[PDB]
Amino acid sequence: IDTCRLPSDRGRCKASFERWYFNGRTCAKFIYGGCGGNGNKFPTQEACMKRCAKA
């Protein structure tokens, strides 16, 4: 699991939506405007846990 290592950006921009991301092993939460994301970013925690907590 090398996707949970990628640093997800919150992308300030003109957006401000709360999303989930991987933090080493556990999940996290912040205001992700939608600018800056690859494989560590995720809308719901269900995917964040199923990608690192379930995998």
UniProtKB/Swiss-Prot annotation:
Outcome reported for the amino acid change (mutating R5I): 14-fold reduction in inhibitory potency toward Kv1.1/KCNA1
Site positions (May bind Kv1.1/KCNA1): L6
Domain BPTI/Kunitz inhibitor: start-end pairs: 4-52
Subcellular localization, as worded in the UniProt entry: Secreted
Coiled-coil ranges (or none): none
GO term, biological process aspect, one: envenomation resulting in negative regulation of voltage-gated potassium channel activity in another organism
Disulfide bond recorded as keyword: yes
Main location (coarse class): secreted
UniProt GO MF annotations: potassium channel regulator activity; serine-type endopeptidase inhibitor activity; toxin activity
Keywords: Disulfide bond, Protease inhibitor, Secreted, Serine protease inhibitor, Signal
GO cellular component: extracellular space
Tissue: Expressed by the venom gland.
Disulfide bonds: C4-C52, C13-C35, C27-C48
Function comment: Serine protease inhibitor that inhibits trypsin (Ki=5.54 uM) at a molar ratio of 1:1.
Protein name from the UniProt record: Kunitz-type kappaPI-theraphotoxin-Hs1a
Organism of provenance: Cyriopagopus schmidti
Full-length numbering of the shown residues: 34 to 88 of 88
